[PDB]
């Protein structure tokens, strides 16, 4: 099988249970609300609720964020099959993940990528699905660099036969002209900074209110 | 050997040199800065950076954040070692790092945190060392809530004799009486919110303003 698209749970090898607490907090959530917006991924998404705001843009179109730092494509795909989009009916699900799937060639990320979209499809019907491109990482040149733009390349064009699926390049020229990116943007050279997230933020703002 | 000091650099799995990035970066601000106050450990020194606000309490301190996400003690041991601590003289190091170390005992992760203060002692003499309590974890009682204490004993018995080695307990009572952490608090059970590094903040500042 594709290891990306066979959906699992990220074992618990700690032993203080955190990741399986997050998701049960998260299903409880889509019990208890009726989002207009879901969002789900890596930390890219779960770290936008604080270290962007968040509630100057997302907040008002009623959004649940479901981001978990370290998540892989099959972990995302694990926790939409196995509570996550429950009682609810959101009009868009916003999908960023990928950058973690450490192992996988980038055709696989993508087959997990599709698969994702199309579980989405599944059991949200009327939702349109829109996919962030993956953002390149590292302060130099790299071979995730590449990675990450061929999986953007292959869900793009996946994407392109798909209505209500959209595919967003959120990135807005991280890699300078040296190769380099500064750590003013990404502190870390995967994570963002509250710098980084604003342009990327407002992209993607820009596209929900467009679909909404 | 005990693995909690025995100096390693983290090593890449990944492909794009983050780790040792931050480490250089960390590197060329000793060589340009001169700080009276380091902070080195794991991610919770790190994101008090950006998600505490570090601005208005640590800032006018001057000093630097070395903290990594995902470090354990002998990775902190090692930056200490290769090149962080050099062409500065600081009046106090700030240590907490422990919780990510998986896998050792809590008398193994007692003796990295004291190879730590050792080091510091050895390398800048002249600078007294805060030594911050591991925090709890998880959303319900679990092992490694009860390792983090044990190690907290640990710690706090090595360094009471030691007039310049400060532990401090900077957890307001994060575990609440019935056994849960607020994701409020700790939105993974981790690591901190905005308003968890409140109360560390305030304690660690006004320690930090006794000493200083």
């Known amino acids: 099988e594709n290891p990306a698209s066979k959906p699992t749970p990220v074992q618990d090898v700690q032993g203080d249970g955190k990741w399986m607490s997050l998701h049960h907090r998260f299903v409880a959530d889509s019990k208890d609300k009726e989002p207009e917006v879901v969002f789900i991924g890596d930390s890219l998404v779960q770290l936008m609720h604080q270290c962007e705001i968040w509630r100057e843009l997302f907040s008002p179109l009623h959004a649940l964020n479901f981001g978990i730092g370290g998540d892989s494509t099959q972990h995302v795909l694990w926790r939409l099959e196995n509570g996550e989009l429950e009682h609810i009916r959101p009009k868009i699900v916003v999908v960023w993940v990928g950058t973690n799937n450490h192992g996988h060639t980038a055709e696989q990320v993508t087959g997990g990528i599709k698969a994702i979209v199309q579980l989405v499809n599944e059991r949200q019907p009327q939702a349109r699905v829109v996919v962030l491109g993956l953002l390149p990482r ?40 040296d190769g380099t990116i500064s750590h003013h943007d990404m502190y870390d050279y995967l994570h963002l900074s509250r710098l980084g997230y604003t342009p990327v933020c407002r992209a993607l703002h820009s596209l929900l209110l467009r679909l909404l």
Chains 1, 2 share one sequence.
């Open 138 to 177: 590292g302060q130099h040149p790299n071979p995730l660099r590449e990675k990450n733009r061929r999986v953007n390349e292959l869900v793009r064009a996946a994407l392109a036969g798909h209505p209500r699926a959209h595919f967003l390049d959120a990135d807005p020229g991280f890699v300078h002209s």
